[PDB]
Design a protein around this nucleic acid. Structure first.
Ligand SMILES: [Mg+2]
Length: 427
DNA sequence: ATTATGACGCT
DNA sequence: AGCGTCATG
């Protein structure tokens, strides 16, 4: 029934904003956003405080426009180094959080601001340790139970709803009404409360979490009650939760596959997938996608929390849109060098911290007039952490791309440059 | 003129 | 080895 594991997804609330707010107390509890590159339209917003979100401020919005919706919006700018955004401060902040989480359980770094947590073992330890002990509501001060309260005064307030639902849940657990998987999830949520308290105490950062039996449900659960709260999605809550859940909300269905599911099957909500046989879904969407959809619409997913706290690749890139697109050989080389230099510093830090060395260098560019993130990818050996070598090699593998008869000019002009270090080995 | 940056499946 | 999809600060 896909109730074998206890899995959490912890997500730092508006992470880059919290990083700037911890550093500059004047930004705390105010409508605030983080932007990069001030010159064009005041900067592109990449993170927004909940206070600012209330005014309709969103990410991918220009700061000048965000200021129209929210006149008192405060802005913090991403550091800029060698002509490009420098995300070091947030990478370092993210490391502080991951190292704390890693104390409680096996962690999978999902992105700069989120990680999956496999609590299956930690739960078992706590249960035998706490054998015969009832779980108090006081152990779950920030936990929502999805789907509760239900059934025929304080409910007008959201904290009231939260407690009433928690009490119904706990009372059921205590009387033996709710299952052993439900108990495991509950102890799981207790551990996540502790993890989230430790993160806040030791970093100042708040986060939300979802607790369920797999990564997809835990990630969905996480988004149900934000900010600074955590949500338990039990196996039993799935039918009602999915019954009105737009397909695009489920992890991996937010794009073309999701749209094709909706269009081909003529459905809107996740629960509607249950009517189809596994073979039916495999026929439309392929063997892997079909099997996954068949189990997922019933709340079952088997993808493991991978034990990996460290990124698999180390990369950096810069876009050069419109007029800014690079048109000279000298220009391309100079930006490659800027990219290579950031990369050298990050790689050397990586090698000292994490005892590994990258062995491959991937060069990626986007040619002018191409919509895809990458027009092309070429690879070469990464044999030394030297910015001059890396930029020189990077140029060598892409220099053929140039269409111009003249040596100096570059055609077609470049929309993007990207360097990625990959294929790490123990050092 | 979403920017910068990830993990991953398919081939 | 290189490309497409999906995600998000
Ligand atoms: Mg997030």
């Amino acid at each position: 029934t896909g109730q074998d594991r206890v899995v959490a997804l912890v997500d730092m609330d508006c992470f880059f904003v919290q990083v700037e707010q911890r550093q500059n107390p004047h930004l705390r509890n105010k409508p605030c956003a983080v932007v990069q590159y001030k010159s064009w339209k005041g900067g592109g917003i990449i993170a927004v405080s909940y206070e600012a979100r209330a005014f309709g401020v969103t990410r991918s919005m220009w700061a000048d426009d965000a200021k129209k919706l929210c006149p008192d919006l405060l802005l913090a700018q991403v550091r800029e180094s060698r002509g490009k955004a420098n995300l070091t401060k947030y990478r370092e902040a993210s490391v502080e959080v991951m190292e704390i989480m890693s104390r409680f359980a096996v962690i999978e770094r999902a992105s700069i601001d989120e990680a999956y947590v496999d609590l299956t073992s930690a739960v078992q330890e706590r249960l035998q340790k706490l054998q015969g002990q009832p779980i108090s509501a006081d152990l779950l001060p920030s936990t929502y139970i999805e789907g509760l309260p239900q059934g025929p005064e304080e409910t007008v307030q959201k904290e009231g709803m939260r407690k009433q639902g928690l009490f119904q849940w706990l009372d059921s657990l205590q009387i033996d009404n709710l299952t052993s998987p439900d108990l495991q999830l509950t102890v799981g949520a207790v551990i996540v409360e502790e993890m989230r308290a430790a993160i806040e105490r030791e970093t100042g950062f708040q986060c939300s979490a979802g607790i369920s039996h797999n990564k997809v449900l835990a990630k969905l659960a996480c988004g149900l009650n934000k900010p600074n709260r955590q949500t338990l999605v039990s196996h039993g809550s799935v039918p009602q939760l999915f019954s009105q859940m737009p397909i695009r909300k489920i992890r991996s269905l937010g794009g073309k596959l999701g749209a094709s599911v909706i269009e081909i099957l003529g459905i809107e909500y996740m629960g509607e997938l249950t009517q189809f046989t596994e073979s039916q879904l495999q026929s439309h969407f392929g063997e892997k996608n079909g099997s996954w959809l068949y189990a997922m619409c019933r709340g079952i997913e088997h993808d493991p929390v991978k034990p990996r706290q460290l990124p698999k690749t180390i990369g950096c890139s810069k876009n050069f849109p419109g007029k800014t697109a690079l048109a000279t050989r000298e220009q391309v080389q100079w930006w490659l060098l800027q990219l290579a230099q950031e990369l050298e510093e990050r790689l050397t830090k990586d090698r000292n911290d994490n005892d590994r060395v990258a062995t491959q260098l991937v060069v990626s560019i986007r040619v002018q007039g191409d919509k895809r993130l990458s027009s092309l990818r070429r690879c070469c050996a990464l044999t030394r952490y030297d910015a001059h070598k890396m930029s020189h090699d990077a140029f060598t593998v892409i220099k053929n791309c140039n269409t111009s008869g003249i040596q100096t000019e570059w055609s077609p002009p470049l929309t993007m440059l990207f360097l990625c270090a990959t294929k790490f080995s123990a050092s």
